[model samples]
Target: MKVKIELKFLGGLESYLEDKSKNYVTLEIDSKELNFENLIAFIRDNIIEKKFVFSDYDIDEKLCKVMVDNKEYSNYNLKDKAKIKPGIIVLVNEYDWEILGTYSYQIKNDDKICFLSTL
Candidate 1:
């Protein structure tokens, strides 16, 4: 099955979108392989405007952390590209991603999500 989601970049995160003018987008992917980790990877790779912003500048690396589904922002594994420091928040259907299984939950169809930058 295929899943479709509405992804929003809230707070200051929208500034980094490939098209800063558009803060939200609709995405479709195979439901069987959907998860927060893979979703995030896709956002970091295709959604965000400048992929090099986190690496070309050192300070950005410290503000890459995200709060999904709830408090105590989770440390995401961005590999060499970047590390989760402290700034972004993840929300699925307006709820914290932590309570919804952070990176393991299987994403369903028509889900609404967001990546908010606290900074």
Candidate 2:
């Protein structure tokens, strides 16, 4: 089964996008493999233009934030293995992914994800 999700790059994160012409993209992928980590890898592999600088410390900002459905990630003690950075926050459906199970959170159809440089 596949689901369609919308991704938006805001703040200064848009600069790293594969196409600087647009800041938003829609992704269609198998729901079975749609964890937050996988979605990020997909972005790094397919959407980022300067793939080399997509790391946490290599980019212009020391930290970037990710939000899903307007939720913000504020928890700092959880273990995140995605490698975008150590402090990168990810929110889901108006709540921090911390309580939602971090990268294990389920992403549903038409979910909106956003990346930004500032909070």
Candidate 3:
């Protein structure tokens, strides 16, 4: 199975995707039953350190907000064929996920996730 997700970046996350032509990037990932932790690792492996684009922001293993189907991962469970939208926010030279929910949040199929910086 495969899941399709549309990701939106705010603040400084736009540089990570490496395509300035668009604010939103679409990703097609192999479908699997992934928990919050697994999903975090996946993102780190796929998005972190591949290029200099994300160098401005540091994505710590413990920091980053991941939402599944618009719900916080901590409060829900993930399913197969899930579509996810991840939002990563960079503010004041710091990532917001560090202060928010991190990767502990649960993720499901066809889920839309957003990351934002707090005021």
Q: Specify the highest-lDDT model's number.
A: 1
- Residue 93 Cα positional deviation in candidate 1, in Å, after optimal superposition: 0.6
> Tens-digit lDDT track for model 1 on 4-42?
678888876678765656788777554354566545654
lDDT per residue as tens, model 3, 1-119: 55556555556554554466555544444435445444434443344325433322233123323343233333212321121233434221243445645554434445554434221
Distance from true location, Cα of 59 in model 3, Å: 13
- Ranked by TM-score from best down, the candidates are 1, 2, 3
Per-residue error (Å), model 2, residue 75: 32
Model 2 C-alpha lDDT per residue in residues 34-109, reported as the tens digit of each score: 4776466546645666644444422111222334333432221112234554444555555666787776778888
Q: How does each model score on lDDT?
A: 0.60, 0.56, 0.41
lDDT score for candidate 3 against the true structure? 0.41
Off by over 4 Å in 2: 56-81
TM-score of candidate 2 against the unseen true structure: 0.63
Best by TM-score: 1
